[PDB]
Amino acid sequence: DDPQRRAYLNNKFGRSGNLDHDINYRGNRETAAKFFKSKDIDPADAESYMNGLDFNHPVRVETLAPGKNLWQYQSPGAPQGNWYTLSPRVQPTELGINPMGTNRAANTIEPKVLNSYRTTQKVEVLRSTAAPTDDFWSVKGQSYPAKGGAQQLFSNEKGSFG
C-alpha cells in the first residue's frame, strides 16, 4: 500500500510511528479502566485518575501480600490518600504530585509529609508510572506541573493499607 496516506491517517488520528507501541498504549489504558471498574468506584473520577497515569510505560494490575512496606506523601492533617510509592527516595514531583499540600483547620499551605505504611492484609493494587500532570489540587492558587517519572500504586481499600 502507498505510504504518505498511511502517514496522513497516523498523524490525523493520534497514531505515532510503530503500531506495537500504540497497541501497548491501548492495552495499558484498557487495563487501567478495567481496574477502576472492577475495584470499587468507577464514576466520573476514574477519568481524572486516568489522566494521572502514563500508559506509554507499562501499567499492570498486581496483587500484594501482607507485610509489604509502602509509603506515601500526604499534606499535614490530611486524610489518607489512595496513591502509594514503593521507595522513600522518590521526589514528590516524580509521583505526579505537588511537593507541598493544603492543611485544613489551619487552612495553611505546608510541605507534604512522607508517611510509612505496612500491609495488614492482602490487597489488590494497580501498578503504574506517573504521568507528567498539572497538580491544581492540594494548592488552592498554585497549579503545579510534575515531572512524573516514577512508579505508583493505587488501591481504594484504605482500611487494608491504613
Binding site: D1, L19, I23
Partner: protein, 392 residues
C-alpha cells in the same frame, strides 16, 4: 445439497465482539441458508471442557452456508485461546479475526495473529466489528491498513486478506442499516466459502504411522505394530523408517489386523505391518513409517510451548537456560535442551512462550506437530512445532 465440514473460530481482543459475531453468524445462517440458531448467553457462558489437559472454557457452535458446513469455536478469555490453540483441543482450518474498529487493534489481537502463525493456523479472515459506532470511513480505512500491517508482520498475506467491515450486534439484531447488518455477515460466510480452502482428509494425507512396538523372529521376519495416523499403507509399497537414527527404506510385505491379513491398512486402524529384510536392531520406538520423502528427522526446532500451572498438575518452579525436560513425541520420550526467548530467563507455570528446543536425538517431525513436555513421566507442559530450524 452436499456440504463438506470446515473448522473455524473467532479470535481477537476482549469485548471486540467475538461471541457476538458467533451469535450473529448462527442467526444469519439460520435465517438465510437454514439451520438452528444459537443463543448469545449460552455461548458467553462457555461450559468447561475437560479434555485431557488443563480445563479450557470453550464454546462449540455450528452453522451451515450455501455450500459448506461450518464448525465454529469461541472462547471467553485470552487464556482459553492460548490453551485451546497451542494444544490440539481445537483445530481451525480457518480463523476469523474480529477487531473493534471503534477501539482499534489491541494486544490480544496481535498476540492471536502471532499464535495463529506459530500454531499453524493457515488462513485468517478479518471482520472489522463495531462499524456502527464509527461515522468516519477514514478511521475504518486506517484500522484496515493497521490489521493488514499486523498480518504482513506475521507472514499472513494481509494485502490479499479479505477484510469485511460491519457490526456483529447490528447484524444480530436484524436491522442491516446501510451495509453493516445481516448483509455484512452474509458476505463474511460467503468469504469463508471463497477464501478458506477445504481441509485435506486424514485418509488423503501421505501415509504416516508411529511405531508402537516391534516384534522380530530371526528367520521368520519382523513386524511393527501401532496405530496408523495418516494415509493408507498397501502391500508391496515402499515406505521410509524415519526417526532416531538414519532414515531406512523398506517394503510392506503384509498388513495384519488381529487374526486377519488385509490388503491394506488405513488411517485410524491399529495394525501390524511386516517389514521385508529388516531386523529389530534396525527398528526402534518413536520411529515412524511414512511415504517416501514426506517426513524427515530433526533435532533443533523453534516451537511455542505452554507450561502447566501448579493447579493443573504442573511444576512448582520456573525454568532456566539449562533446563532439560523430557519431550514426548507421538509414541516416544526424548530428552532435549531448551533455549528461552530474548529478554526472558524465568517463566512461571501457566505462561506460554517461544522456545527453541534442541533434542539429543533426531525425530521425524513436521511444522504444526503438537507434542508433550513431561517431568518424571507426568505432563508439565504442552507445545507445538512452530518452525523447523535447518542446519545448513
Amino acid at each position: 445439497r452436499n456440504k463438506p465440514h470446515v473448522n473455524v473460530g473467532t479470535i481477537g481482543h476482549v469485548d471486540h465482539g467475538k461471541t457476538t459475531l458467533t451469535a450473529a453468524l448462527t442467526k444469519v445462517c439460520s435465517d438465510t441458508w437454514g439451520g438452528s440458531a444459537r443463543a448469545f448467553d449460552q455461548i458467553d457462558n462457555a461450559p468447561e471442557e475437560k479434555a485431557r489437559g488443563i480445563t479450557i472454557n470453550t464454546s462449540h457452535v455450528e452453522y451451515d452456508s450455501a455450500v459448506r458446513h461450518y464448525a465454529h469455536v469461541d472462547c471467553p478469555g485470552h487464556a482459553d485461546y492460548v490453551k485451546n490453540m497451542i494444544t490440539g483441543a481445537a483445530q481451525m482450518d480457518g480463523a476469523i479475526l474480529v477487531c473493534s474498529a471503534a477501539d482499534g487493534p489491541m494486544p490480544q489481537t496481535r498476540e492471536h495473529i502471532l499464535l495463529s502463525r506459530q500454531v499453524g493456523v493457515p488462513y485468517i479472515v478479518v471482520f472489522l466489528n463495531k462499524a456502527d459506532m464509527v461515522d468516519d470511513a477514514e478511521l475504518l480505512e486506517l484500522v484496515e491498513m493497521e490489521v493488514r500491517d499486523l498480518l504482513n508482520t506475521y507472514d499472513f498475506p494481509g494485502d490479499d486478506t479479505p477484510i469485511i467491515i460491519g457490526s456483529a450486534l447490528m447484524a444480530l439484531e436484524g436491522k442491516d442499516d446501510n451495509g453493516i447488518g445481516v448483509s455484512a455477515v452474509q458476505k463474511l460466510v460467503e468469504t469463508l466459502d471463497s477464501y478458506i480452502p477445504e481441509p485435506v482428509r486424514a485418509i488423503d494425507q501421505p501415509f504416516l504411522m508411529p511405531i508402537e512396538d516391534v516384534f522380530s523372529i530371526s528367520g521368520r521376519g519382523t513386524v511393527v505394530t501401532g496405530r496408523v495416523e495418516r494415509g493408507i499403507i498397501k502391500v508391496q509399497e515402499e515406505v521410509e523408517i524415519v526417526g532416531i537414527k538414519a532414515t531406512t527404506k523398506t517394503t510392506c510385505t503384509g498388513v495384519e489386523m488381529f487374526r486377519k491379513l488385509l490388503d491394506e491398512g488405513r488411517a485410524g486402524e491399529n495394525v501390524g505391518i511386516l517389514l521385508r529384510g529388516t531386523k529389530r536392531e534396525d527398528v526402534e520406538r518413536g520411529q515412524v513409517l511414512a511415504k517416501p520423502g514426506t517426513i524427515k528427522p530433526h533435532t533443533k526446532f523453534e516451537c511455542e510451548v505452554y507450561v502447566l500451572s501448579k493447579e493443573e498438575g504442573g511444576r512448582h518452579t520456573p525454568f532456566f537456560k539449562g533446563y532439560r525436560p523430557q519431550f514426548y513425541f507421538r509414541t516416544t520420550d526424548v530428552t532435549g535442551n531448551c533455549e528461552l526467548p530474548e529478554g526472558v530467563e524465568m517463566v512461571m507455570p501457566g505462561d506460554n512462550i517461544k522456545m527453541v528446543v534442541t533434542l539429543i536425538a533426531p525425530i521425524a517431525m513436521e511444522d504444526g506437530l503438537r507434542f508433550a513436555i513431561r517431568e518424571g513421566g507426568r505432563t508439565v507442559g504442552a507445545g507445538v512445532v512452530a518452525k523447523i530450524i535447518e542446519l545448513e
